[PDB]
Amino acid sequence: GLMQFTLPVRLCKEIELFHFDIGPFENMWPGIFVYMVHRSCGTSCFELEKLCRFIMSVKKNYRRVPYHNWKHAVTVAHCMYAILQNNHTLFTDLERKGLLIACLCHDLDHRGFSNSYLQKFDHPLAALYSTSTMEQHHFSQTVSILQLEGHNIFSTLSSSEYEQVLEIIRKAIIATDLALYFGNRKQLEEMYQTGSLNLNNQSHRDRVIGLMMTACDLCSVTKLWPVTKLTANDIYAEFWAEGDEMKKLGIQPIPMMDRDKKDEVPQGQLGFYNAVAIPCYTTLTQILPPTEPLLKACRDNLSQWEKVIRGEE
């Protein structure tokens, strides 16, 4: 019970910052997550025995893919930690329990292919789940690991509280489907502008939670330029793999997934920062002002991509 996780001085300080990078030491990632849970939620939220077992079954069910891997899981969970920590009084007990677990679990058993390629390949999962294919699968994988004997980290919640947290985790994971974000953020932009936004309205909380999930999921664009740049290599490694497989289906992929069209990548990132990232963190900073550091980091990285195109790097 009195067993606290303590990090080295540089991590203990840097971890509280939005732009924290969890480092190349995989065996430190569990303790970093448990440390974030203990300070976000409490030393009591979970039986340390069951959480540790949970964490390690979750790790085992991520694959060895260039981007959608165990590192991505802990990285997305860390972004949520900083949002939660900078917004102490806005989220309930069950939300702070749910959302970190939601983030660690959000890409379980990812193969490195989009919902598009699953449908064109005619993968079994595309017949099981017609929309948000991989995200319904990710949520299914979370339930199954929660159901392994000794793994139920919520065991100590009432029937209602348990369904409340599963519900938060399900919507949280489904919201990571980027196809759903555009309408989520538009709706949120309207509600905030017309003043109709109300955090006592569950429908409204759901939408704000969805946007937080998108913000955390995309958080590689809110790191320092060297992390953002080296992570982009992992992202495009998956995209080029998927384009290769599209070509094997006899379909010419979109230039973003064509490894012949690598020159178009810098311009590819401008479109993405302007179309997806900046809007996402703009509305987030409007609804939760203390998350402004993410928009600032995103704007700087937009500048760094501009400077790449202009041949300055």
Ligand SMILES: CCCCOc1cnc(N)nc1OCC
């Ligand atoms: C397919 C997953 C959706 C996340 O897509 C991205 C995330 N972060 C960056 N820097 N670029 C992305 O695509 C840009 C072409």
Ligand SMILES: [Mg+2]
């Ligand atoms: Mg995903």
Ligand SMILES: [Zn+2]
């Ligand atoms: Zn993800």
